[PDB]
């Protein structure tokens, strides 16, 4: 695939969605000149606050991200570069898992749960074979394309910004402890904050961490304090996110082995998790 490079006029931001460090993201209008047709998108703008550096060019990076698609990511459709950058996507209706898993809870049932892990590896595992790092795996970030299927989003999108050294402007607990110590970001990295996610679905959108100050959170970590066993989970599903959370990075699993391992356990889902 090739995502496309808009006009500024081929784009109309109609109510805003939500926003974070990462932009603001709007439902939006894709009206491609003289086709009289109006395209639901969405839209995310991203300004450099900090610097106020533009967008005017579109880097390899961008067209990375833009050449990239799969069952289970979002497919960029294109951006637009300017003072602020946008990219557009499909509008995805029904939402992010996270807030999905918060109001339905046990009612879901294990194959679903079981089936989104599934999904969500696949998708990374796609990401990391075509050599782009999520840097922003989290709950929130998976997205219903419809009831049964959901799509990572948001990868790439954290490297479209130079890093600021000004002295809570990172997701630091869903990262990796080499990312908090070091910056550095891989697919390992990814794997890491995939273990996160999987514990926010089986706990149905607990808070990690829930209680403690993000400055203690890497102490906490070195010291060997990982997320709690969720209520449904047997210790088979949650070793495979113990895994994911080991300091050394070469201990983790890859996204194959996460995929093939929720594969299996998909295939009898309460032996797996006791949702009562
Ligand atoms: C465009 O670019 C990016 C967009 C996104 N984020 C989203 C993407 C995508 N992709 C797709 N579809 C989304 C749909 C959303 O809202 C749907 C449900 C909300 N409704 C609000 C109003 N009430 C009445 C009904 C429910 C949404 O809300 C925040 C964000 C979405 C990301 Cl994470 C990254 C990038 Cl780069």
Redesign the pocket.
């Known amino acids: 695939v090739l995502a496309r490079i808009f006009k500024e006029t081929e784009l109309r931001k109609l109510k805003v ?2 926003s974070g460090v990462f932009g603001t ?1 709007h ?1 939006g209008v894709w009206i491609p000149e003289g086709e009289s047709i109006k395209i639901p998108v ?3 703008v991203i300004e450099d606050k900090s610097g106020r550096q533009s967008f005017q060019a579109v880097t390899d990076h961008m067209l990375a991200i833009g050449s990239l698609d799969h069952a289970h990511i ?1 497919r ?1 459709l294109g951006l637009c570069p300017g003072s602020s950058l946008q ?10 898992l996270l807030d999905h898993v918060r109001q339905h809870r046990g009612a879901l049932g294990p194959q679903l749960l079981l089936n989104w892990g599934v999904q969500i590896a696949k998708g990374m595992y796609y990401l990391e074979e075509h050599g782009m790092v999520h840097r922003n795996l989290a709950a929130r ?1 998976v ?1 219903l394309k419809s009831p049964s299927q959901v799509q990572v ?2 990868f790439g ?1 954290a490297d479209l910004l130079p890093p600021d050294d000004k002295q809570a402007k990172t997701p630091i607990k869903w990262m990796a402890l080499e990312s908090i110590h070091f910056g550095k970001y891989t697919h390992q990295s990814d794997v890491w904050s995939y273990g996160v996610t999987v514990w926010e679905l089986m706990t149905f959108g607990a808070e990690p961490y829930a209680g403690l100050r993000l400055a203690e959170v890497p102490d906490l970590l070195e010291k060997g304090e990982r997320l709690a066993q969720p209520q449904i989970c047997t210790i088979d599903v949650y070793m495979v996110m113990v895994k994911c959370w080991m300091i050394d990075e070469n201990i983790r699993p890859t996204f194959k082995e996460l995929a093939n391992e929720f594969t299996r356990m998909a295939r009898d889902p309460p032996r797996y998790l006791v949702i009562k």
Do not use: E, F, M, R
């Open positions: 969605l939500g993201v439902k969405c839209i995310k979002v960029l990219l557009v996507t499909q509008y995805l209706p029904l939402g992010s970030n997205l989003a948001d999108v």
